[PDB]
Amino acid sequence: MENFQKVEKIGEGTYGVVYKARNKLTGEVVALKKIRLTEGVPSTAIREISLLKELNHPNIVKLLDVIHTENKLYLVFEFLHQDLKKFMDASALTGIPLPLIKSYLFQLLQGLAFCHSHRVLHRDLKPQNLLINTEGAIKLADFGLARAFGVPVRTYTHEVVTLWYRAPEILLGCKYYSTAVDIWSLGCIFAEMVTRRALFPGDSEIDQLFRIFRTLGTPDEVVWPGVTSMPDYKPSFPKWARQDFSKVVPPLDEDGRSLLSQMLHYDPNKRISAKAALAHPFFQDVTKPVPHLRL
Amino acid sequence: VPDYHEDIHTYLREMEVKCKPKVGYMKKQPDITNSMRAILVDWLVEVGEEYKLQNETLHLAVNYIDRFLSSMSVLRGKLQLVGTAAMLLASKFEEIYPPEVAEFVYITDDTYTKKQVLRMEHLVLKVLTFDLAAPTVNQFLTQYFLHQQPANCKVESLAMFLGELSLIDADPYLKYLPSVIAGAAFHLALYTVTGQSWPESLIRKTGYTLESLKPCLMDLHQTYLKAPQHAQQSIREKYKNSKYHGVSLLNPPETLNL
Numbered sequence A: 001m002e003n004f005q006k007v008e009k010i011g012e013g014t015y016g017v018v019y020k021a022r023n024k025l026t027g028e029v030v031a032l033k034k035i036r037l038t039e040g041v042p043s044t045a046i047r048e049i050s051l052l053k054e055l056n057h058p059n060i061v062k063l064l065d066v067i068h069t070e071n072k073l074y075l076v077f078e079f080l081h082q083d084l085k086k087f088m089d090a091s092a093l094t095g096i097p098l099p100l101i102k103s104y105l106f107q108l109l110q111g112l113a114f115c116h117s118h119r120v121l122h123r124d125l126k127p128q129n130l131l132i133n134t135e136g137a138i139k140l141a142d143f144g145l146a147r148a149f150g151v152p153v154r155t156y157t158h159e160v161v162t163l164w165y166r167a168p169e170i171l172l173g174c175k176y177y178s179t180a181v182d183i184w185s186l187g188c189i190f191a192e193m194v195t196r197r198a199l200f201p202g203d204s205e206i207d208q209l210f211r212i213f214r215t216l217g218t219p220d221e222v223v224w225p226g227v228t229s230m231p232d233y234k235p236s237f238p239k240w241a242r243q244d245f246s247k248v249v250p251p252l253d254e255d256g257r258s259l260l261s262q263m264l265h266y267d268p269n270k271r272i273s274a275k276a277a278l279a280h281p282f283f284q285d286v287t288k289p290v291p292h293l294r295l
Numbered sequence B: 001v002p003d004y005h006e007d008i009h010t011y012l013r014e015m016e017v018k019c020k021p022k023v024g025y026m027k028k029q030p031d032i033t034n035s036m037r038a039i040l041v042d043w044l045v046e047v048g049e050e051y052k053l054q055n056e057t058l059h060l061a062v063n064y065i066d067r068f069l070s071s072m073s074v075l076r077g078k079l080q081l082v083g084t085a086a087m088l089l090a091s092k093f094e095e096i097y098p099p100e101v102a103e104f105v106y107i108t109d110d111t112y113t114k115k116q117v118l119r120m121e122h123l124v125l126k127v128l129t130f131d132l133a134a135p136t137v138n139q140f141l142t143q144y145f146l147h148q149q150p151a152n153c154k155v156e157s158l159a160m161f162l163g164e165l166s167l168i169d170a171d172p173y174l175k176y177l178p179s180v181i182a183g184a185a186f187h188l189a190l191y192t193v194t195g196q197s198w199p200e201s202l203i204r205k206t207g208y209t210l211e212s213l214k215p216c217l218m219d220l221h222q223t224y225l226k227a228p229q230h231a232q233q234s235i236r237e238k239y240k241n242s243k244y245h246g247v248s249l250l251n252p253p254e255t256l257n258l
Protein backbone atom coordinates (compact mmCIF):
# COMPACT_ATOMS: atom_id res chain seq x y z
CA MET A 1 0.00 0.00 0.00
CA GLU A 2 3.03 2.27 0.49
CA ASN A 3 3.54 2.87 -3.24
CA PHE A 4 0.37 4.95 -3.40
CA GLN A 5 -0.07 8.67 -2.79
CA LYS A 6 -3.53 9.86 -1.75
CA VAL A 7 -4.52 13.00 -3.63
CA GLU A 8 -8.11 13.81 -2.52
CA LYS A 9 -11.51 12.36 -1.63
CA ILE A 10 -13.50 12.07 -4.88
CA GLY A 11 -16.38 9.86 -3.79
CA GLU A 12 -18.55 9.08 -0.79
CA GLY A 13 -20.94 6.25 0.07
CA THR A 14 -21.95 3.49 2.48
CA TYR A 15 -19.76 0.87 0.67
CA GLY A 16 -16.68 2.98 1.58
CA VAL A 17 -14.63 6.12 0.86
CA VAL A 18 -13.14 6.61 -2.62
CA TYR A 19 -9.86 8.56 -3.00
CA LYS A 20 -8.04 9.78 -6.09
CA ALA A 21 -4.49 8.47 -5.78
CA ARG A 22 -1.18 8.36 -7.66
CA ASN A 23 1.21 5.45 -8.18
CA LYS A 24 4.52 6.90 -6.92
CA LEU A 25 6.54 4.46 -9.07
CA THR A 26 4.71 4.22 -12.42
CA GLY A 27 2.89 7.58 -12.27
CA GLU A 28 -0.48 6.00 -13.05
CA VAL A 29 -3.48 7.82 -11.58
CA VAL A 30 -6.04 5.63 -9.80
CA ALA A 31 -9.20 5.61 -7.70
CA LEU A 32 -8.70 3.81 -4.37
CA LYS A 33 -11.72 2.29 -2.63
CA LYS A 34 -11.15 1.94 1.13
CA ILE A 35 -12.95 -0.54 3.38
CA ARG A 36 -12.35 -0.71 7.17
CA LEU A 37 -12.12 -4.13 8.90
CA THR A 38 -16.31 -6.87 12.46
CA GLU A 39 -17.94 -9.53 10.25
CA GLY A 40 -14.87 -10.36 8.13
CA VAL A 41 -14.73 -9.23 4.50
CA PRO A 42 -17.99 -7.43 3.58
CA SER A 43 -20.26 -9.41 1.23
CA THR A 44 -20.52 -6.38 -1.09
CA ALA A 45 -16.73 -6.25 -1.37
CA ILE A 46 -16.55 -9.99 -2.06
CA ARG A 47 -19.03 -9.77 -4.91
CA GLU A 48 -17.57 -6.55 -6.34
CA ILE A 49 -14.05 -7.95 -6.67
CA SER A 50 -14.80 -11.47 -7.90
CA LEU A 51 -17.24 -10.16 -10.48
CA LEU A 52 -15.21 -7.19 -11.84
CA LYS A 53 -12.27 -9.60 -12.26
CA GLU A 54 -14.22 -11.44 -14.96
CA LEU A 55 -15.55 -8.37 -16.69
CA ASN A 56 -12.83 -6.76 -18.75
CA HIS A 57 -14.65 -4.25 -20.99
CA PRO A 58 -14.19 -0.61 -22.12
CA ASN A 59 -17.58 0.36 -20.57
CA ILE A 60 -17.06 -1.35 -17.21
CA VAL A 61 -14.64 0.19 -14.67
CA LYS A 62 -11.30 -1.61 -14.57
CA LEU A 63 -10.42 -3.07 -11.21
CA LEU A 64 -6.63 -2.88 -11.39
CA ASP A 65 -5.53 -4.39 -8.09
CA VAL A 66 -6.86 -5.61 -4.76
CA ILE A 67 -4.52 -5.01 -1.86
CA HIS A 68 -5.41 -6.83 1.34
CA THR A 69 -3.81 -6.11 4.70
CA GLU A 70 -4.91 -7.43 8.13
CA ASN A 71 -6.86 -4.32 9.23
CA LYS A 72 -7.58 -2.74 5.80
CA LEU A 73 -8.69 -3.67 2.28
CA TYR A 74 -8.19 -1.38 -0.73
CA LEU A 75 -9.69 -1.78 -4.22
CA VAL A 76 -7.58 -0.08 -6.88
CA PHE A 77 -9.47 1.20 -9.90
CA GLU A 78 -8.46 2.99 -13.06
CA PHE A 79 -9.26 6.67 -12.44
CA LEU A 80 -12.29 8.40 -13.95
CA HIS A 81 -12.91 12.13 -13.47
CA GLN A 82 -16.53 12.49 -12.32
CA ASP A 83 -19.88 10.66 -12.37
CA LEU A 84 -22.92 11.21 -14.59
CA LYS A 85 -25.01 12.77 -11.84
CA LYS A 86 -22.42 15.48 -11.15
CA PHE A 87 -22.21 16.11 -14.90
CA MET A 88 -26.01 16.27 -15.18
CA ASP A 89 -26.23 18.75 -12.30
CA ALA A 90 -23.62 20.84 -14.09
CA SER A 91 -25.43 20.68 -17.46
CA ALA A 92 -28.64 22.00 -15.86
CA LEU A 93 -28.79 25.31 -17.76
CA THR A 94 -27.33 24.28 -21.09
CA GLY A 95 -28.49 20.62 -21.36
CA ILE A 96 -26.61 17.52 -22.50
CA PRO A 97 -26.53 17.54 -26.36
CA LEU A 98 -28.45 14.65 -27.99
CA PRO A 99 -25.36 13.40 -29.89
CA LEU A 100 -23.73 12.80 -26.46
CA ILE A 101 -26.84 11.35 -24.75
CA LYS A 102 -26.93 8.82 -27.58
CA SER A 103 -23.19 8.12 -27.20
CA TYR A 104 -23.54 7.61 -23.47
CA LEU A 105 -26.61 5.38 -23.80
CA PHE A 106 -24.94 3.35 -26.54
CA GLN A 107 -21.90 2.65 -24.32
CA LEU A 108 -24.02 2.07 -21.21
CA LEU A 109 -25.94 -0.54 -23.21
CA GLN A 110 -22.66 -2.13 -24.29
CA GLY A 111 -21.42 -2.36 -20.70
CA LEU A 112 -24.72 -3.85 -19.62
CA ALA A 113 -24.83 -6.23 -22.56
CA PHE A 114 -21.37 -7.55 -21.65
CA CYS A 115 -22.41 -7.88 -18.00
CA HIS A 116 -25.60 -9.77 -18.74
CA SER A 117 -23.92 -12.11 -21.26
CA HIS A 118 -21.48 -12.99 -18.45
CA ARG A 119 -24.38 -13.75 -16.06
CA VAL A 120 -23.89 -10.53 -14.04
CA LEU A 121 -26.78 -8.28 -12.93
CA HIS A 122 -25.76 -4.80 -11.85
CA ARG A 123 -28.95 -4.21 -9.87
CA ASP A 124 -28.09 -0.65 -8.87
CA LEU A 125 -27.66 1.51 -11.97
CA LYS A 126 -28.06 5.21 -11.19
CA PRO A 127 -26.20 8.31 -12.43
CA GLN A 128 -23.70 8.13 -9.51
CA ASN A 129 -22.60 4.61 -10.43
CA LEU A 130 -21.72 5.70 -13.96
CA LEU A 131 -18.37 7.30 -14.64
CA ILE A 132 -17.34 9.64 -17.40
CA ASN A 133 -14.01 10.90 -18.61
CA THR A 134 -13.04 14.01 -20.58
CA GLU A 135 -12.64 11.90 -23.71
CA GLY A 136 -16.21 10.65 -24.18
CA ALA A 137 -16.27 7.35 -22.31
CA ILE A 138 -18.88 6.29 -19.78
CA LYS A 139 -18.42 3.20 -17.62
CA LEU A 140 -20.51 1.10 -15.25
CA ALA A 141 -19.27 1.39 -11.69
CA ASP A 142 -20.11 0.25 -8.18
CA PHE A 143 -20.71 -3.50 -8.21
CA GLY A 144 -21.38 -3.98 -4.50
CA LEU A 145 -24.97 -5.03 -5.08
CA ALA A 146 -24.14 -6.80 -8.33
CA ARG A 147 -25.00 -10.51 -8.52
CA ALA A 148 -24.08 -13.58 -10.58
CA PHE A 149 -27.15 -15.32 -11.98
CA GLY A 150 -25.98 -18.81 -13.02
CA VAL A 151 -28.87 -19.63 -10.68
CA PRO A 152 -31.74 -17.06 -10.68
CA VAL A 153 -31.25 -14.29 -8.11
CA ARG A 154 -33.99 -14.11 -5.46
CA THR A 155 -35.17 -10.59 -4.55
CA TYR A 156 -34.46 -9.20 -1.08
CA THR A 157 -37.59 -8.44 1.02
CA HIS A 158 -36.05 -5.09 2.01
CA GLU A 159 -34.83 -3.75 -1.36
CA VAL A 160 -31.69 -1.72 -0.53
CA VAL A 161 -31.62 -0.60 -4.22
CA THR A 162 -32.25 3.10 -5.08
CA LEU A 163 -35.94 4.10 -5.13
CA TRP A 164 -36.22 6.24 -8.31
CA TYR A 165 -34.63 3.81 -10.76
CA ARG A 166 -36.41 0.75 -9.40
CA ALA A 167 -38.25 -1.49 -11.88
CA PRO A 168 -42.00 -2.08 -11.44
CA GLU A 169 -41.64 -5.86 -11.07
CA ILE A 170 -39.59 -5.41 -7.89
CA LEU A 171 -41.98 -2.83 -6.39
CA LEU A 172 -44.85 -5.23 -7.16
CA GLY A 173 -42.94 -7.94 -5.26
CA CYS A 174 -41.77 -10.48 -7.85
CA LYS A 175 -39.66 -13.41 -6.64
CA TYR A 176 -36.61 -13.09 -8.90
CA TYR A 177 -34.51 -10.41 -10.55
CA SER A 178 -33.79 -10.62 -14.29
CA THR A 179 -31.81 -8.56 -16.80
CA ALA A 180 -34.96 -6.47 -17.23
CA VAL A 181 -34.34 -4.53 -13.99
CA ASP A 182 -31.02 -3.21 -15.31
CA ILE A 183 -32.67 -2.07 -18.56
CA TRP A 184 -35.43 -0.26 -16.68
CA SER A 185 -32.84 1.74 -14.71
CA LEU A 186 -31.06 2.77 -17.89
CA GLY A 187 -34.38 3.73 -19.47
CA CYS A 188 -34.98 6.11 -16.56
CA ILE A 189 -31.45 7.50 -16.89
CA PHE A 190 -31.90 7.93 -20.65
CA ALA A 191 -35.13 9.89 -20.11
CA GLU A 192 -33.37 11.95 -17.45
CA MET A 193 -30.51 13.09 -19.69
CA VAL A 194 -33.20 14.18 -22.15
CA THR A 195 -35.62 15.88 -19.74
CA ARG A 196 -33.07 17.39 -17.30
CA ARG A 197 -35.32 15.99 -14.56
CA ALA A 198 -35.82 12.62 -12.83
CA LEU A 199 -38.49 10.58 -14.61
CA PHE A 200 -39.87 8.75 -11.57
CA PRO A 201 -38.86 10.57 -8.37
CA GLY A 202 -40.96 8.69 -5.79
CA ASP A 203 -41.13 9.21 -2.01
CA SER A 204 -42.10 5.68 -0.99
CA GLU A 205 -42.61 2.38 -2.81
CA ILE A 206 -46.26 3.19 -3.49
CA ASP A 207 -45.39 6.75 -4.57
CA GLN A 208 -42.74 5.27 -6.88
CA LEU A 209 -45.29 2.80 -8.21
CA PHE A 210 -47.99 5.45 -8.72
CA ARG A 211 -45.54 7.76 -10.51
CA ILE A 212 -44.69 4.94 -12.91
CA PHE A 213 -48.45 4.48 -13.44
CA ARG A 214 -49.40 8.13 -14.04
CA THR A 215 -46.95 8.18 -16.97
CA LEU A 216 -47.09 4.70 -18.57
CA GLY A 217 -50.59 3.79 -17.42
CA THR A 218 -51.63 1.27 -14.81
CA PRO A 219 -50.84 -2.20 -16.17
CA ASP A 220 -53.58 -4.80 -16.61
CA GLU A 221 -53.56 -8.52 -17.51
CA VAL A 222 -53.55 -7.72 -21.23
CA VAL A 223 -50.41 -5.54 -21.18
CA TRP A 224 -48.76 -7.62 -18.41
CA PRO A 225 -49.94 -11.23 -18.10
CA GLY A 226 -50.01 -12.19 -14.41
CA VAL A 227 -49.65 -8.68 -12.95
CA THR A 228 -52.83 -9.03 -10.84
CA SER A 229 -51.44 -12.14 -9.12
CA MET A 230 -48.16 -10.48 -8.06
CA PRO A 231 -47.80 -10.33 -4.23
CA ASP A 232 -47.79 -6.54 -3.85
CA TYR A 233 -50.42 -5.72 -6.47
CA LYS A 234 -53.69 -4.38 -5.05
CA PRO A 235 -57.19 -4.33 -6.66
CA SER A 236 -57.69 -0.84 -5.20
CA PHE A 237 -54.93 0.55 -7.45
CA PRO A 238 -56.02 3.57 -9.53
CA LYS A 239 -56.38 2.99 -13.28
CA TRP A 240 -54.26 5.75 -14.86
CA ALA A 241 -54.11 6.20 -18.64
CA ARG A 242 -50.89 5.89 -20.65
CA GLN A 243 -49.50 9.32 -21.49
CA ASP A 244 -48.26 10.49 -24.90
CA PHE A 245 -44.46 9.92 -24.88
CA SER A 246 -44.09 13.17 -26.85
CA LYS A 247 -45.34 14.92 -23.71
CA VAL A 248 -43.07 12.78 -21.49
CA VAL A 249 -39.87 13.23 -23.53
CA PRO A 250 -40.55 16.28 -25.82
CA PRO A 251 -37.18 16.74 -27.54
CA LEU A 252 -36.74 13.05 -28.53
CA ASP A 253 -37.13 11.85 -32.13
CA GLU A 254 -39.50 8.97 -32.99
CA ASP A 255 -36.76 6.33 -32.61
CA GLY A 256 -35.75 7.80 -29.24
CA ARG A 257 -39.33 7.35 -28.04
CA SER A 258 -39.50 3.95 -29.76
CA LEU A 259 -36.42 2.86 -27.80
CA LEU A 260 -37.42 4.50 -24.52
CA SER A 261 -40.88 2.92 -24.55
CA GLN A 262 -39.18 -0.46 -25.07
CA MET A 263 -36.73 -0.09 -22.17
CA LEU A 264 -39.67 1.02 -20.06
CA HIS A 265 -41.79 -1.95 -21.20
CA TYR A 266 -43.94 -3.38 -18.38
CA ASP A 267 -43.63 -7.18 -18.69
CA PRO A 268 -39.99 -8.01 -17.77
CA ASN A 269 -40.19 -10.81 -20.34
CA LYS A 270 -41.05 -8.49 -23.23
CA ARG A 271 -38.81 -5.58 -22.09
CA ILE A 272 -35.87 -5.01 -24.44
CA SER A 273 -32.49 -6.59 -23.69
CA ALA A 274 -29.29 -4.54 -23.80
CA LYS A 275 -28.11 -6.73 -26.70
CA ALA A 276 -31.20 -5.88 -28.81
CA ALA A 277 -31.30 -2.14 -28.07
CA LEU A 278 -27.84 -1.77 -29.63
CA ALA A 279 -29.41 -2.81 -32.96
CA HIS A 280 -32.28 -0.31 -32.54
CA PRO A 281 -32.53 2.34 -35.35
CA PHE A 282 -31.81 5.19 -32.84
CA PHE A 283 -28.08 4.32 -32.93
CA GLN A 284 -27.66 4.29 -36.72
CA ASP A 285 -25.88 7.66 -36.59
CA VAL A 286 -24.03 7.17 -33.27
CA THR A 287 -20.82 9.16 -32.76
CA LYS A 288 -18.52 9.60 -29.75
CA PRO A 289 -18.52 13.30 -28.70
CA VAL A 290 -16.50 14.80 -25.84
CA PRO A 291 -18.29 16.24 -22.82
CA HIS A 292 -17.38 19.58 -21.29
CA LEU A 293 -16.54 18.73 -17.68
CA ARG A 294 -15.48 20.88 -14.71
CA LEU A 295 -12.83 20.39 -11.98
CA VAL B 1 -35.44 -13.07 -21.44
CA PRO B 2 -33.82 -15.53 -23.94
CA ASP B 3 -31.09 -13.41 -25.65
CA TYR B 4 -28.29 -14.12 -23.12
CA HIS B 5 -28.91 -17.77 -22.21
CA GLU B 6 -26.73 -19.04 -25.04
CA ASP B 7 -23.87 -16.58 -24.28
CA ILE B 8 -24.06 -17.50 -20.60
CA HIS B 9 -23.89 -21.24 -21.24
CA THR B 10 -20.77 -20.86 -23.43
CA TYR B 11 -19.31 -18.57 -20.76
CA LEU B 12 -19.96 -20.94 -17.84
CA ARG B 13 -18.58 -23.72 -20.01
CA GLU B 14 -15.39 -21.71 -20.51
CA MET B 15 -15.28 -20.76 -16.82
CA GLU B 16 -15.81 -24.24 -15.39
CA VAL B 17 -12.46 -25.29 -16.86
CA LYS B 18 -10.75 -22.31 -15.17
CA CYS B 19 -12.41 -22.61 -11.74
CA LYS B 20 -11.81 -26.41 -11.60
CA PRO B 21 -9.75 -28.22 -8.85
CA LYS B 22 -6.81 -30.53 -9.68
CA VAL B 23 -8.14 -34.05 -10.43
CA GLY B 24 -5.64 -36.01 -8.30
CA TYR B 25 -5.03 -33.69 -5.34
CA MET B 26 -6.16 -35.99 -2.52
CA LYS B 27 -3.22 -38.35 -3.10
CA LYS B 28 -0.87 -35.34 -2.71
CA GLN B 29 -2.54 -34.46 0.61
CA PRO B 30 -0.63 -36.54 3.16
CA ASP B 31 -3.10 -36.27 6.07
CA ILE B 32 -6.56 -36.27 4.51
CA THR B 33 -8.37 -39.12 2.73
CA ASN B 34 -11.41 -39.01 0.45
CA SER B 35 -13.45 -40.24 3.44
CA MET B 36 -12.53 -37.24 5.64
CA ARG B 37 -13.82 -34.96 2.89
CA ALA B 38 -17.02 -36.97 2.42
CA ILE B 39 -17.65 -36.46 6.17
CA LEU B 40 -17.03 -32.70 5.77
CA VAL B 41 -19.26 -32.17 2.71
CA ASP B 42 -22.12 -34.12 4.34
CA TRP B 43 -21.74 -31.91 7.41
CA LEU B 44 -22.03 -28.79 5.26
CA VAL B 45 -25.32 -30.25 3.93
CA GLU B 46 -26.45 -30.36 7.56
CA VAL B 47 -25.22 -26.79 8.02
CA GLY B 48 -27.09 -25.75 4.83
CA GLU B 49 -30.36 -27.17 6.18
CA GLU B 50 -29.85 -25.68 9.66
CA TYR B 51 -29.56 -22.17 8.24
CA LYS B 52 -31.99 -22.64 5.34
CA LEU B 53 -29.33 -21.80 2.75
CA GLN B 54 -29.64 -22.12 -1.03
CA ASN B 55 -28.23 -25.34 -2.41
CA GLU B 56 -26.04 -23.16 -4.66
CA THR B 57 -24.19 -22.01 -1.50
CA LEU B 58 -23.27 -25.61 -0.71
CA HIS B 59 -22.17 -26.24 -4.32
CA LEU B 60 -19.87 -23.16 -4.21
CA ALA B 61 -18.56 -24.03 -0.76
CA VAL B 62 -17.49 -27.42 -2.12
CA ASN B 63 -15.68 -25.81 -5.07
CA TYR B 64 -13.83 -23.46 -2.72
CA ILE B 65 -12.79 -26.33 -0.42
CA ASP B 66 -11.61 -28.40 -3.39
CA ARG B 67 -9.50 -25.65 -5.01
CA PHE B 68 -8.09 -24.74 -1.60
CA LEU B 69 -6.94 -28.31 -0.97
CA SER B 70 -5.67 -28.39 -4.56
CA SER B 71 -2.71 -26.20 -3.56
CA MET B 72 -2.47 -26.07 0.26
CA SER B 73 -1.33 -28.91 2.51
CA VAL B 74 -3.87 -29.04 5.33
CA LEU B 75 -3.85 -31.13 8.53
CA ARG B 76 -6.96 -33.11 9.49
CA GLY B 77 -7.72 -31.08 12.64
CA LYS B 78 -7.80 -27.90 10.55
CA LEU B 79 -9.94 -29.28 7.68
CA GLN B 80 -13.19 -28.13 9.34
CA LEU B 81 -11.83 -24.57 9.68
CA VAL B 82 -11.24 -24.74 5.92
CA GLY B 83 -14.76 -26.11 5.42
CA THR B 84 -16.26 -23.44 7.67
CA ALA B 85 -14.53 -20.41 6.09
CA ALA B 86 -15.54 -21.67 2.63
CA MET B 87 -19.18 -22.00 3.73
CA LEU B 88 -18.96 -18.42 5.07
CA LEU B 89 -17.56 -17.06 1.82
CA ALA B 90 -20.06 -19.03 -0.26
CA SER B 91 -22.79 -17.62 2.01
CA LYS B 92 -21.58 -14.04 1.60
CA PHE B 93 -21.34 -14.49 -2.18
CA GLU B 94 -24.71 -16.24 -2.70
CA GLU B 95 -27.25 -15.71 0.14
CA ILE B 96 -29.44 -12.61 0.48
CA TYR B 97 -28.82 -12.17 4.24
CA PRO B 98 -25.79 -14.37 5.19
CA PRO B 99 -25.47 -15.93 8.67
CA GLU B 100 -23.39 -14.12 11.30
CA VAL B 101 -19.78 -15.29 11.73
CA ALA B 102 -20.50 -15.90 15.42
CA GLU B 103 -22.76 -18.65 14.07
CA PHE B 104 -20.24 -20.33 11.80
CA VAL B 105 -18.17 -20.39 15.00
CA TYR B 106 -21.10 -21.93 16.86
CA ILE B 107 -21.68 -24.91 14.50
CA THR B 108 -18.11 -26.21 14.95
CA ASP B 109 -18.84 -26.88 18.66
CA ASP B 110 -16.49 -23.95 19.26
CA THR B 111 -13.45 -25.94 18.06
CA TYR B 112 -12.23 -22.63 16.58
CA THR B 113 -12.27 -19.05 17.90
CA LYS B 114 -14.13 -16.26 16.06
CA LYS B 115 -10.71 -14.81 15.23
CA GLN B 116 -9.63 -18.16 13.73
CA VAL B 117 -12.57 -18.36 11.32
CA LEU B 118 -12.03 -14.78 10.12
CA ARG B 119 -8.31 -15.34 9.54
CA MET B 120 -9.13 -18.47 7.55
CA GLU B 121 -11.62 -16.50 5.43
CA HIS B 122 -8.90 -14.04 4.50
CA LEU B 123 -6.52 -16.92 3.66
CA VAL B 124 -9.11 -18.73 1.51
CA LEU B 125 -9.64 -15.51 -0.45
CA LYS B 126 -5.89 -15.25 -0.91
CA VAL B 127 -5.41 -18.80 -2.27
CA LEU B 128 -8.51 -18.59 -4.48
CA THR B 129 -7.17 -15.21 -5.72
CA PHE B 130 -10.67 -13.77 -5.04
CA ASP B 131 -12.23 -15.79 -7.87
CA LEU B 132 -15.45 -16.90 -6.21
CA ALA B 133 -17.91 -16.75 -9.12
CA ALA B 134 -17.59 -20.48 -9.86
CA PRO B 135 -19.85 -22.56 -12.15
CA THR B 136 -21.67 -25.33 -10.27
CA VAL B 137 -23.54 -28.53 -11.14
CA ASN B 138 -26.51 -26.46 -9.94
CA GLN B 139 -25.86 -23.55 -12.32
CA PHE B 140 -25.74 -26.11 -15.12
CA LEU B 141 -28.97 -27.87 -14.14
CA THR B 142 -30.69 -24.48 -14.10
CA GLN B 143 -29.68 -23.96 -17.76
CA TYR B 144 -30.78 -27.47 -18.72
CA PHE B 145 -34.22 -27.19 -17.08
CA LEU B 146 -35.14 -24.49 -19.64
CA HIS B 147 -34.97 -27.26 -22.28
CA GLN B 148 -37.62 -29.40 -20.56
CA GLN B 149 -40.97 -29.97 -22.30
CA PRO B 150 -42.79 -29.14 -20.06
CA ALA B 151 -41.25 -28.43 -16.62
CA ASN B 152 -41.34 -31.43 -14.29
CA CYS B 153 -40.36 -30.81 -10.67
CA LYS B 154 -39.81 -34.44 -9.72
CA VAL B 155 -37.25 -34.55 -12.55
CA GLU B 156 -35.61 -31.31 -11.33
CA SER B 157 -35.75 -32.40 -7.68
CA LEU B 158 -34.17 -35.74 -8.60
CA ALA B 159 -31.43 -34.11 -10.71
CA MET B 160 -30.66 -31.71 -7.84
CA PHE B 161 -30.47 -34.67 -5.45
CA LEU B 162 -28.34 -36.74 -7.85
CA GLY B 163 -25.95 -33.84 -8.49
CA GLU B 164 -25.76 -33.05 -4.79
CA LEU B 165 -24.79 -36.64 -4.00
CA SER B 166 -21.89 -36.15 -6.43
CA LEU B 167 -20.33 -33.54 -4.09
CA ILE B 168 -19.76 -36.05 -1.25
CA ASP B 169 -17.59 -38.57 -3.07
CA ALA B 170 -14.40 -37.00 -4.43
CA ASP B 171 -13.88 -40.45 -5.95
CA PRO B 172 -15.03 -40.52 -8.77
CA TYR B 173 -16.63 -37.07 -9.20
CA LEU B 174 -13.52 -34.95 -9.43
CA LYS B 175 -12.90 -36.68 -12.79
CA TYR B 176 -15.80 -34.76 -14.34
CA LEU B 177 -16.54 -31.10 -15.03
CA PRO B 178 -19.72 -29.72 -13.42
CA SER B 179 -21.40 -29.46 -16.87
CA VAL B 180 -20.91 -33.19 -17.42
CA ILE B 181 -22.04 -34.27 -13.92
CA ALA B 182 -25.08 -32.03 -14.48
CA GLY B 183 -25.80 -33.64 -17.88
CA ALA B 184 -25.47 -37.12 -16.38
CA ALA B 185 -27.61 -35.99 -13.47
CA PHE B 186 -30.32 -34.60 -15.78
CA HIS B 187 -30.73 -37.64 -18.07
CA LEU B 188 -30.69 -40.05 -15.12
CA ALA B 189 -33.35 -38.01 -13.32
CA LEU B 190 -35.46 -37.66 -16.49
CA TYR B 191 -35.08 -41.36 -17.35
CA THR B 192 -36.17 -42.40 -13.84
CA VAL B 193 -39.21 -40.09 -13.73
CA THR B 194 -40.53 -39.86 -17.32
CA GLY B 195 -38.61 -42.58 -19.19
CA GLN B 196 -37.35 -40.07 -21.79
CA SER B 197 -33.65 -39.33 -22.52
CA TRP B 198 -31.01 -36.61 -22.99
CA PRO B 199 -32.99 -34.41 -25.43
CA GLU B 200 -31.82 -33.53 -28.93
CA SER B 201 -31.84 -29.79 -28.13
CA LEU B 202 -29.46 -30.20 -25.15
CA ILE B 203 -27.11 -32.31 -27.29
CA ARG B 204 -26.95 -29.35 -29.67
CA LYS B 205 -26.58 -26.83 -26.82
CA THR B 206 -23.90 -28.72 -24.89
CA GLY B 207 -22.19 -30.64 -27.68
CA TYR B 208 -22.44 -33.66 -25.38
CA THR B 209 -23.79 -36.77 -27.07
CA LEU B 210 -25.43 -39.26 -24.68
CA GLU B 211 -22.62 -41.69 -25.51
CA SER B 212 -20.10 -39.00 -24.41
CA LEU B 213 -21.90 -38.79 -21.05
CA LYS B 214 -21.82 -42.62 -20.62
CA PRO B 215 -18.65 -42.84 -18.40
CA CYS B 216 -19.92 -40.26 -15.88
CA LEU B 217 -23.48 -41.52 -16.25
CA MET B 218 -22.21 -45.00 -15.32
CA ASP B 219 -20.71 -43.82 -12.03
CA LEU B 220 -23.68 -41.65 -11.11
CA HIS B 221 -26.09 -44.54 -11.63
CA GLN B 222 -23.98 -46.54 -9.16
CA THR B 223 -23.98 -43.76 -6.55
CA TYR B 224 -27.77 -43.58 -6.89
CA LEU B 225 -28.06 -47.35 -6.37
CA LYS B 226 -25.77 -47.56 -3.34
CA ALA B 227 -27.23 -44.31 -1.91
CA PRO B 228 -28.97 -45.89 1.13
CA GLN B 229 -25.80 -47.80 2.19
CA HIS B 230 -23.42 -44.82 1.94
CA ALA B 231 -21.78 -43.68 5.18
CA GLN B 232 -22.97 -40.12 4.51
CA GLN B 233 -26.76 -39.78 4.69
CA SER B 234 -27.61 -36.07 5.05
CA ILE B 235 -28.62 -35.45 1.44
CA ARG B 236 -30.93 -38.50 1.31
CA GLU B 237 -32.55 -37.15 4.48
CA LYS B 238 -32.73 -33.66 2.98
CA TYR B 239 -34.40 -34.97 -0.21
CA LYS B 240 -36.92 -37.21 1.58
CA ASN B 241 -38.86 -34.01 2.22
CA SER B 242 -42.18 -33.27 0.49
CA LYS B 243 -40.66 -30.02 -0.83
CA TYR B 244 -38.15 -31.95 -2.95
CA HIS B 245 -40.97 -34.35 -3.97
CA GLY B 246 -39.42 -37.15 -1.86
CA VAL B 247 -37.16 -38.04 -4.79
CA SER B 248 -34.65 -39.93 -2.61
CA LEU B 249 -37.28 -42.63 -2.02
CA LEU B 250 -37.70 -43.30 -5.76
CA ASN B 251 -36.09 -46.59 -6.75
CA PRO B 252 -33.25 -46.28 -9.27
CA PRO B 253 -33.63 -48.30 -12.48
CA GLU B 254 -31.41 -51.41 -12.39
CA THR B 255 -30.01 -51.00 -15.93
CA LEU B 256 -29.61 -47.86 -18.03
CA ASN B 257 -29.91 -49.60 -21.44
CA LEU B 258 -26.77 -47.84 -22.78
Ligand SMILES: c1cnn2ncc(-c3ccnc(NC4CC4)n3)c2c1
Residues within 6 Å of the ligand: A010, A011, A013, A018, A031, A033, A061, A077, A078, A079, A080, A081, A082, A083, A128, A129, A131, A141, A142
Ligand atom coordinates in the same frame (compact mmCIF):
# COMPACT_ATOMS: atom_id res chain seq x y z
C1 LIG C 1 -18.30 5.53 -6.87
C2 LIG C 1 -18.56 4.27 -6.15
N1 LIG C 1 -17.86 3.18 -6.18
N2 LIG C 1 -16.78 3.27 -6.97
N3 LIG C 1 -15.95 2.22 -7.11
C3 LIG C 1 -15.01 2.67 -7.95
C4 LIG C 1 -15.23 4.01 -8.35
C5 LIG C 1 -14.46 4.87 -9.21
C6 LIG C 1 -13.68 4.31 -10.19
C7 LIG C 1 -12.98 5.20 -10.96
N4 LIG C 1 -13.02 6.53 -10.80
C8 LIG C 1 -13.80 6.97 -9.81
N5 LIG C 1 -13.85 8.35 -9.63
C9 LIG C 1 -15.18 8.94 -9.68
C10 LIG C 1 -15.76 9.63 -8.48
C11 LIG C 1 -15.36 10.42 -9.68
N6 LIG C 1 -14.53 6.19 -9.00
C12 LIG C 1 -16.39 4.37 -7.69
C13 LIG C 1 -17.20 5.52 -7.62
